């Protein structure tokens, strides 16, 4: 017996594919504490630093010994909680990492993010591409490019559970091919994906006249104590002097579903003082159910007359600010039996029909969020 070893099929350069059992390669569980606040991080590490530690699955060595993988990573987080409590968890992924970075929700939640409340959802899944400028990735690519991952808590417990919990997640190789997302400077598209964290809105209980405002001059970043926070989408938007388009916001519920309120969202100007005849603007009434968690609302560009400035000096007065605002007011009172507050999270996801005008010389400083 003598066969030719050069004709064997030891040169299969195909990617890993199959069912979800044959494509899982890592499974990581993180400890959520019993008494947590809003803003502290639960996990922050490189993806290679947790993908090779005690993870021996059906597609582990096949992933570790493959040069090109042509599928997007699918992640499924599973944690459930009863309806008499509530928090908000955000899983954010980034392409690179520097020394002593900031763990804010505004900074990390730009490229790929999954933000959900476990009291309203049994499990949450999302898909992302590790190589944003190409159609393939590998484990050595994630090792060398310092691909980061972080699970953070953006809104703490309304009511504390009995013990500290454990949230597990498992990574797969989905049957979705990798596509690139490239932000060109000269010829931008008709849809600009931002995923900008606009801020958190906390309406208390038993408050009669409360109305929150968010400025639409979103360029320049976010404020901090003699500091600013930036990401690549806000830096890309802050190149132009004016911008125009119809905005698409997503509102997430970050409190317990036993705290109910009706919120009217509209577009205004300047600083108002809660006139009851303020619903004469075309406004959207948002009223969450128990299974309802996230609602998308789109303000068309018929609500905006002209373009407005991307950046406004924060030392200016309220009368000396010409940019439009996004106002949210309580239609009725905040009714609950627990002692929590009604929390909302607004995120400007994309700007359709995007038109940029001019060139920005720049304005130093940024306003605080929330």
């Amino acid at each position: 017996m003598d066969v030719d070893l050069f004709k064997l099929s030891l040169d299969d350069t195909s990617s890993v594919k199959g069912s979800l059992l044959d494509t899982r390669f890592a499974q990581v569980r993180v400890v959520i504490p019993k008494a947590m606040a809003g803003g502290n991080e639960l996990l922050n590490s490189n993806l290679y630093d947790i993908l090779v530690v005690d993870n021996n699955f059906r597609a582990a060595a096949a992933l570790a010994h493959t040069h090109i993988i042509e599928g997007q990573i699918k992640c499924v987080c599973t944690i459930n909680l009863p309806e008499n409590t509530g928090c908000c968890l955000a899983l954010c992924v980034n392409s690179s990492n520097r020394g002593q970075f900031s763990t804010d929700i505004y900074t990390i939640g730009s490229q790929d993010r999954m933000l959900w409340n476990p009291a309203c959802s049994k499990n949450s899944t999302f898909t992302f591409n590790p190589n944003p400028c190409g159609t393939g990735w590998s484990l050595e690519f994630l090792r060398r490019t310092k691909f980061h991952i972080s699970v953070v808590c953006v809104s703490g417990w309304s009511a504390q559970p009995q013990t500290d919990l454990v949230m597990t997640m498992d990574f797969f190789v989905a049957n979705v091919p990798c596509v690139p997302r490239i932000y060109n400077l000269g010829s931008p598209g008709q849809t600009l994906w931002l995923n900008r964290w606009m801020g958190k809105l906390s309406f208390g209980q038993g408050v009669s006249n409360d109305i929150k405002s968010m400025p639409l001059a979103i360029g320049g970043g976010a404020g901090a104590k003699d500091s600013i926070l930036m990401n690549m989408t806000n830096a890309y938007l802050s190149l132009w002097r004016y911008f125009h388009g119809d905005l698409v916001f997503e509102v997430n519920k970050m409190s317990s579903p036993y705290i109910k309120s009706t919120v009217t969202f509209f577009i205004g100007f300047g600083g108002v003082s809660f006139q009851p005849e303020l619903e004469d603007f075309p406004n959207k009434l948002v009223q969450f159910s128990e299974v309802q968690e996230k609602i998308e609302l789109k303000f068309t560009r018929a609500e905006f007359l002209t373009a407005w400035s991307t950046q406004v000096d924060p030392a200016a007065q309220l009368a000396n600010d010409g940019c439009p605002y996004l106002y949210a007011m309580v239609h009725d009172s905040t009714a609950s039996t627990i002692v929590g507050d009604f929390n909302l999270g607004v995120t400007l996801t994309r700007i359709e029909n995007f038109a940029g005008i001019g060139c920005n010389p720049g304005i130093q400083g940024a306003r605080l969020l929330g």
């Binding site: 980034n94 392409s95 690179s96 990492n97 520097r98 020394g99 002593q100 970075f101 900031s102 900074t107 990390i108 730009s110 490229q111 190589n131 944003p132 400028c133 190409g134 690519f141 060398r144 490019t145 310092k146 980061h148 690139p180 997302r181 490239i182 932000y183 060109n184 400077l185 000269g186 010829s187 360029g219 970043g221 901090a224 003699d226 500091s227 600013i228 926070l229 930036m230 990401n231 690549m232 989408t233 830096a235 890309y236 802050s238 190149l239 060139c359 920005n360 010389p361 720049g362 130093q364 400083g365």
Partner: protein, 182 residues
Amino acid sequence: NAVVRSSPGIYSNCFSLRAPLKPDGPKSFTCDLMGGGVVTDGDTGWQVTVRNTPVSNLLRTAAWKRGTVHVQVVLAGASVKRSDWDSTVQIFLRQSMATSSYDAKIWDICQPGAAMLEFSFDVVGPNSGFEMWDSNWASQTSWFLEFLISNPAQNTLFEVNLRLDENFSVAGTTLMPPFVLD
């Protein structure tokens, strides 16, 4: 003399340096045009500020970059007579600060009072033309601008301005510490 005409774009000031008050000999420094870092080869007394212009914020907080970058360097001097000017400035555009590497572009100017120069380069990379800053993936590197001063008691201010071209592209986000205002 001819008229002073520059490039028709708009340039954002990224780095601003000031020499110390009492020097002794030649001084030198280096600016990282893609990472936003300045290392001054010498003692203290150098006043170095990195501005928060949107071009510098985009070049810092992006991972994969691709396209043409225009640089404009403005050198300013003190109030000394034109018959006593003896300061010469050597500028090296390099791709690494290792001793084994070579300079990509060389300028050597000596103009009394104040001088202005401009050039451009291309950030291309191995991914799809995209290049990440100082990665160990394909042994990529940054772009460095080294300044060597012969008489730092005459020329004091150094301004570096940047402007991105219309074929520039970015992809991905990079987490960084918050930028200290100035």
